[PDB]
Amino acid sequence: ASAPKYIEHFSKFSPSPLSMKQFLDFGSNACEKTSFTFLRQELPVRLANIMKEINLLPDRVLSTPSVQLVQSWYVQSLLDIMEFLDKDPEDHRTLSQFTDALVTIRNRHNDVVPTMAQGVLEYKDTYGDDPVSNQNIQYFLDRFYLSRISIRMLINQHTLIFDPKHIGSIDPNCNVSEVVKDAYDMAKLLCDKYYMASPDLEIQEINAANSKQPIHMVYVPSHLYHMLFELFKNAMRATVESHESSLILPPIKVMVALGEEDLSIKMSDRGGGVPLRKIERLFSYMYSTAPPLAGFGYGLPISRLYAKYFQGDLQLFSMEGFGTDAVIYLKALSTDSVERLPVY
Amino acid sequence: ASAPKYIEHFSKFSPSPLSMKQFLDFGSNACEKTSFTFLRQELPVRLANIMKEINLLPDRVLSTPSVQLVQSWYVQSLLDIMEFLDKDPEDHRTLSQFTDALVTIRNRHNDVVPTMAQGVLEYKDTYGDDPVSNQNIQYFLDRFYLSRISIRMLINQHTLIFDPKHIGSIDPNCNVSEVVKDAYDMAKLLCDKYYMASPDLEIQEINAANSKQPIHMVYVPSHLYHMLFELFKNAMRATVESHESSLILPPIKVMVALGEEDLSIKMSDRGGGVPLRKIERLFSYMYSTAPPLAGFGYGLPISRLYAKYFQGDLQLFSMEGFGTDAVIYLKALSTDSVERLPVY
Ligand SMILES: Cc1cnc(Cl)nc1-c1ccc(N(Cc2ccc(CNC(=O)C(F)(F)F)cc2)C(=O)c2ccc(O)cc2O)cc1
Ligand SMILES: Cc1cnc(Cl)nc1-c1ccc(N(Cc2ccc(CNC(=O)C(F)(F)F)cc2)C(=O)c2ccc(O)cc2O)cc1
Ligand SMILES: CC(C)c1ccc(COc2ccc(CC(=O)NCCN)cc2Cl)cc1
Ligand SMILES: CC(C)c1ccc(COc2ccc(CC(=O)NCCN)cc2Cl)cc1
Ligand SMILES: [Mg+2]
Ligand SMILES: [Mg+2]
Ligand SMILES: [Mg+2]
Ligand SMILES: [Mg+2]
């Protein structure tokens, strides 16, 4: 077969980050043929870039069953996409079987996270969990997961639009507060199920330039939901367990600020907090992988990748003895919301 | 002369970080001879370590008048200290002229900050202000200033004690709130002088393990004052200028938390804040050097060195459109308060 030639050829290209605008433009008025011709070039570049990095991992990592299985998904997905390079954009059955091919590729990779998690486990027990190992895992998974988010975003844009308010997974009129409430509601439901107390929510908005207006943005609200949900679940765990022997339960307080450049979402809790020393660990794939609410959500590392993905960030800071603020930093202006892709 | 042999010899040694305990022990019951024999070894190691680093700077930096002048102070101070190596600890005139020598050395170096500032200016205008330059300046000055804080601390411990509550510059019973109030009071005074409005203060304490108790610690309260004062001055500037056309002026809110491991001091303002993109810049010697309240205080970079100096930190996070939290993280337990010295 040809996977290594394909990988080599296509990793000579640089991925092409898209902006929100570019996304919205692909997504109306059936630009279908256009999405197609972009994607058949772009997905291989993206796939191959990460595949090259996978192949450069040391052999004692690369020969593990978990990496072998993922190496195998990428090869197959890259080949499935190949089939279409020389095919004819005007032929509607071409467009059709390409959408089928996208769905199948998306399915094939649904379980990477737990797959990678086993590889981390194997390596931790097999070579150790020293700081150097940790940085290398962190470095590799951040890139790899960031890479993964970007590909799933391309595929979802195409399959949702090519099967009027929403544009695939982008809401050009996202109501930030609405998403905060829904993710709160869902985390509370879980909370009340496993603890039979749950804190209230208090939302405050600060729309600097327009005192009055509800705060809206162009965003991928499924992403924003992932991040809010992870954050609520942690804050609820903290708050509830830290107040078992007490009567008053602090609310969880969220602030939504709209500046010239940032849209920031702070979520404050009084769960007793974490010492500065132990904070980075929460972001570590290595330390946050071991063999109640613990089962739910995308995790802090991935939540932060979602924020970084459109040039934002997710940060924590705590006051041990008191509680923790978690802030999601997003770009307020759609013209600043451009894909951030691992550097090659 | 012998400066380069001395530098080489003494940079073969590693500085010896001291803990609060070690500091308190030198500082009572006249351990004077002991402080003397420690210092005559330790100061040269410390001086020489930084001097070695100064000599490794590229020539286009090293040949500048500002660096030449500082290179010259260190040489002289290292030599003044040399005079004592073979001298006799039992002779009281020895002890005496050594204290004189310490005072003189401290004076000789009083003006490094503005000296270094001219070197940064020269280099910025002479070679540019690109990101690489910036990291190298940051790296060098952090180390150099951290080095400087540690030496001044040794000298001040000796000269204050060898000329009962306080122990030189260490207060084994520092009242954190007291220092917050005093630095607030001083920053307000300045504020009212240049603006004729100034925000109020609100202090809240959270003593996790002892709900009741005022929060106390073993610290160098002059340091804690430097950091609180810089932070108040910024928060007052922000708050006041951001509310000129408005009637209500938010207070500046400080929280003092005492955990198992951290003592944290958060100072919150509603000055409108800073976008995430521009935050690191506030810590940059390069960008925060250009040719009202602006004249006062030690600066953010040095304030953070003071916090790092005893294994703590100083961090900022803002919500553009709203305001800024600044948190000083200190070690709650004196057994964790050990000098952090630049690595060699
Ligand atoms: C990482 C994580 C994953 N899943 C779940 Cl359910 N929780 C966490 C989690 C949650 C809170 C924390 N802590 C530390 C913490 C841990 C446990 C507790 C509960 N208290 C106790 O267990 C105690 F035993 F002391 F009583 C409080 C705080 C925080 O301070 C915190 C961190 C992130 C965040 O977004 C929000 C936060 O509040 C750490 C881990
Ligand atoms: C670094 C510094 C040094 N000296 C002085 Cl007097 N001030 C500052 C300073 C202060 C505040 C900021 N800003 C940004 C800022 C700058 C200006 C203003 C005032 N508003 C305006 O000038 C406006 F023009 F928009 F109205 C508000 C915020 C902050 O958000 C902030 C930073 C650190 C800190 O500890 C506290 C802070 O509040 C930046 C620089
Ligand atoms: C399965 C995934 C999560 C995973 C598991 C484990 C790893 C571990 O990766 C390491 C560990 C140590 C070193 C230093 C070193 O030895 N360098 C020289 C090259 N051998 C390099 C790498 Cl790439 C990465 C990704
Ligand atoms: C005066 C103080 C504040 C000061 C002023 C200026 C500097 C600047 O230092 C630089 C700038 C660029 C580089 C890259 C490079 O050229 N590397 C190869 C070696 N030439 C290295 C260094 Cl050490 C430091 C400290
Ligand atoms: Mg598309
Ligand atoms: Mg963080
Ligand atoms: Mg001493
Ligand atoms: Mg910071």
Side-chain angles (χ1 to χ4, degrees), chain A residues 1-28 30-70 72-344, chain B residues 1-28 30-70 72-344:
Chain A
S2 289
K5 175 207 196 185
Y6 288 163
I7 293 164
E8 172 65 39
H9 166 68
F10 277 115
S11 56
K12 271 152 92 80
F13 301 97
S14 271
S16 286
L18 313 184
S19 60
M20 286 294 172
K21 194 178 190 198
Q22 289 159 310
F23 270 113
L24 289 181
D25 296 348
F26 275 116
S28 100
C31 283
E32 190 176 356
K33 322 188 296 161
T34 319
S35 175
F36 175 73
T37 70
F38 176 71
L39 283 182
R40 73 169 180 193
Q41 177 70 3
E42 185 71 5
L43 291 183
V45 178
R46 292 199 199 196
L47 294 158
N49 271 279
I50 198 51
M51 296 163 67
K52 183 186 173 129
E53 192 171 338
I54 294 170
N55 293 333
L56 307 182
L57 287 155
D59 199 57
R60 70 183 174 293
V61 166
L62 223 204
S63 69
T64 60
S66 60
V67 179
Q68 284 297 93
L69 176 66
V70 357
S72 82
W73 298 342
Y74 277 72
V75 174
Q76 186 61 59
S77 293
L78 168 68
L79 295 169
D80 294 3
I81 279 157
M82 299 313 238
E83 286 303 293
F84 292 88
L85 270 176
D86 69 355
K87 213 150 264 45
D88 161 42
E90 318 291 326
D91 183 339
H92 284 300
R93 276 171 285 98
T94 293
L95 300 196
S96 230
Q97 65 203 187
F98 182 74
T99 289
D100 294 329
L102 293 201
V103 172
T104 296
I105 283 165
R106 201 194 27 235
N107 305 320
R108 177 143 70 221
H109 295 247
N110 283 321
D111 292 336
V112 272
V113 167
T115 310
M116 291 289 186
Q118 283 308 136
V120 169
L121 246 5
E122 159 169 20
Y123 177 96
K124 180 154 169 220
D125 290 318
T126 253
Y127 288 101
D129 51 349
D130 54 282
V132 166
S133 280
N134 184 70
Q135 270 132 42
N136 279 100
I137 292 158
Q138 204 59 33
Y139 180 80
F140 167 72
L141 288 180
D142 272 356
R143 283 160 63 85
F144 173 86
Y145 287 139
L146 185 57
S147 162
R148 192 188 191 247
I149 291 158
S150 85
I151 294 164
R152 295 173 109 261
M153 175 85 182
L154 295 176
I155 292 182
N156 287 322
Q157 286 305 285
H158 191 99
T159 66
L160 289 165
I161 295 153
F162 310 114
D163 33 24
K165 282 93 156 266
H166 285 63
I167 304 303
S169 82
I170 291 144
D171 184 348
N173 231 248
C174 184
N175 176 318
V176 180
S177 263
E178 189 39 56
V179 189
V180 171
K181 290 144 155 168
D182 293 334
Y184 169 81
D185 286 341
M186 185 59 235
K188 176 175 186 147
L189 197 150
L190 292 181
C191 195
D192 282 340
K193 174 79 70 206
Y194 309 97
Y195 293 105
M196 303 97 95
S198 68
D200 297 354
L201 166 76
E202 292 183 16
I203 295 191
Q204 195 184 144
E205 301 221 330
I206 307 294
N207 182 343
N210 281 7
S211 215
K212 25 263 275 42
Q213 305 311 121
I215 285 163
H216 288 56
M217 60 171 322
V218 182
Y219 207 59
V220 184
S222 48
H223 292 193
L224 179 52
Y225 197 101
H226 304 322
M227 305 188 287
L228 287 166
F229 177 78
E230 247 300 299
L231 291 180
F232 278 123
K233 148 216 108 167
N234 296 340
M236 286 178 176
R237 186 266 189 97
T239 307
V240 168
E241 305 182 4
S242 76
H243 287 66
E244 276 167 7
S245 318
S246 147
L247 263 14
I248 61 289
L249 198 71
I252 289 163
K253 295 172 163 207
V254 164
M255 167 132 80
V256 182
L258 181 68
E260 288 308 299
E261 181 169 336
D262 299 344
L263 204 163
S264 307
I265 293 143
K266 169 175 290 204
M267 171 184 316
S268 306
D269 77 49
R270 284 191 172 108
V274 213
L276 185 61
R277 205 181 33 107
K278 299 171 169 128
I279 253 166
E280 61 152 19
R281 267 224 290 253
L282 295 176
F283 279 106
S284 168
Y285 304 100
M286 194 176 60
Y287 305 115
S288 82
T289 308
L293 272 56
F296 290 85
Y298 277 71
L300 280 171
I302 288 146
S303 289
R304 178 214 243 166
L305 295 186
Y306 279 122
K308 291 192 166 154
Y309 172 52
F310 276 111
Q311 311 295 328
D313 201 5
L314 189 156
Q315 276 174 27
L316 291 184
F317 38 93
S318 192
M319 324 259 311
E320 184 189 39
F322 178 66
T324 294
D325 297 2
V327 185
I328 301 168
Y329 288 105
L330 302 169
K331 286 305 193 176
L333 296 187
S334 61
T335 54
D336 289 332
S337 302
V338 180
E339 288 197 283
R340 152 132 95 113
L341 301 184
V343 188
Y344 308 97
Chain B
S2 289
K5 175 207 196 185
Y6 288 163
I7 293 164
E8 172 65 39
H9 166 68
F10 277 115
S11 56
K12 271 152 92 80
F13 301 97
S14 271
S16 286
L18 313 184
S19 60
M20 286 294 172
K21 194 178 190 198
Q22 289 159 310
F23 270 113
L24 289 181
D25 296 348
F26 275 116
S28 100
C31 283
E32 190 176 356
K33 322 188 296 161
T34 319
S35 175
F36 175 73
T37 70
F38 176 71
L39 283 182
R40 73 169 180 193
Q41 177 70 3
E42 185 71 5
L43 291 183
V45 178
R46 292 199 199 196
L47 294 158
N49 271 279
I50 198 51
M51 296 163 67
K52 183 186 173 129
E53 192 171 338
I54 294 170
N55 293 333
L56 307 182
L57 287 155
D59 199 57
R60 70 183 174 293
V61 166
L62 223 204
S63 69
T64 60
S66 60
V67 179
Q68 284 297 93
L69 176 66
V70 357
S72 82
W73 298 342
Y74 277 72
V75 174
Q76 186 61 59
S77 293
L78 168 68
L79 295 169
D80 294 3
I81 279 157
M82 299 313 238
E83 286 303 293
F84 292 88
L85 270 176
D86 69 355
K87 213 150 264 45
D88 161 42
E90 318 291 326
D91 183 339
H92 284 300
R93 276 171 285 98
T94 293
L95 300 196
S96 230
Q97 65 203 187
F98 182 74
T99 289
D100 294 329
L102 293 201
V103 172
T104 296
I105 283 165
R106 201 194 27 235
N107 305 320
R108 177 143 70 221
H109 295 247
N110 283 321
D111 292 336
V112 272
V113 167
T115 310
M116 291 289 186
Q118 283 308 136
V120 169
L121 246 5
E122 159 169 20
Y123 177 96
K124 180 154 169 220
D125 290 318
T126 253
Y127 288 101
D129 51 349
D130 54 282
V132 166
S133 280
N134 184 70
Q135 270 132 42
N136 279 100
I137 292 158
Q138 204 59 33
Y139 180 80
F140 167 72
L141 288 180
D142 272 356
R143 283 160 63 85
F144 173 86
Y145 287 139
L146 185 57
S147 162
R148 192 188 191 247
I149 291 158
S150 85
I151 294 164
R152 295 173 109 261
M153 175 85 182
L154 295 176
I155 292 182
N156 287 322
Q157 286 305 285
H158 191 99
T159 66
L160 289 165
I161 295 153
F162 310 114
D163 33 24
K165 282 93 156 266
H166 285 63
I167 304 303
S169 82
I170 291 144
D171 184 348
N173 231 248
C174 184
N175 176 318
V176 180
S177 263
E178 189 39 56
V179 189
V180 171
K181 290 144 155 168
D182 293 334
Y184 169 81
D185 286 341
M186 185 59 235
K188 176 175 186 147
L189 197 150
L190 292 181
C191 195
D192 282 340
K193 174 79 70 206
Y194 309 97
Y195 293 105
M196 303 97 95
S198 68
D200 297 354
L201 166 76
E202 292 183 16
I203 295 191
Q204 195 184 144
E205 301 221 330
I206 307 294
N207 182 343
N210 281 7
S211 215
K212 25 263 275 42
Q213 305 311 121
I215 285 163
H216 288 56
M217 60 171 322
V218 182
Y219 207 59
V220 184
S222 48
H223 292 193
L224 179 52
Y225 197 101
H226 304 322
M227 305 188 287
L228 287 166
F229 177 78
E230 247 300 299
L231 291 180
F232 278 123
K233 148 216 108 167
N234 296 340
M236 286 178 176
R237 186 266 189 97
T239 307
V240 168
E241 305 182 4
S242 76
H243 287 66
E244 276 167 7
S245 318
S246 147
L247 263 14
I248 61 289
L249 198 71
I252 289 163
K253 295 172 163 207
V254 164
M255 167 132 80
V256 182
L258 181 68
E260 288 308 299
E261 181 169 336
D262 299 344
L263 204 163
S264 307
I265 293 143
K266 169 175 290 204
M267 171 184 316
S268 306
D269 77 49
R270 284 191 172 108
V274 213
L276 185 61
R277 205 181 33 107
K278 299 171 169 128
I279 253 166
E280 61 152 19
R281 267 224 290 253
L282 295 176
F283 279 106
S284 168
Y285 304 100
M286 194 176 60
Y287 305 115
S288 82
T289 308
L293 272 56
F296 290 85
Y298 277 71
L300 280 171
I302 288 146
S303 289
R304 178 214 243 166
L305 295 186
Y306 279 122
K308 291 192 166 154
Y309 172 52
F310 276 111
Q311 311 295 328
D313 201 5
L314 189 156
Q315 276 174 27
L316 291 184
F317 38 93
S318 192
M319 324 259 311
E320 184 189 39
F322 178 66
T324 294
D325 297 2
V327 185
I328 301 168
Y329 288 105
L330 302 169
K331 286 305 193 176
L333 296 187
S334 61
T335 54
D336 289 332
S337 302
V338 180
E339 288 197 283
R340 152 132 95 113
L341 301 184
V343 188
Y344 308 97

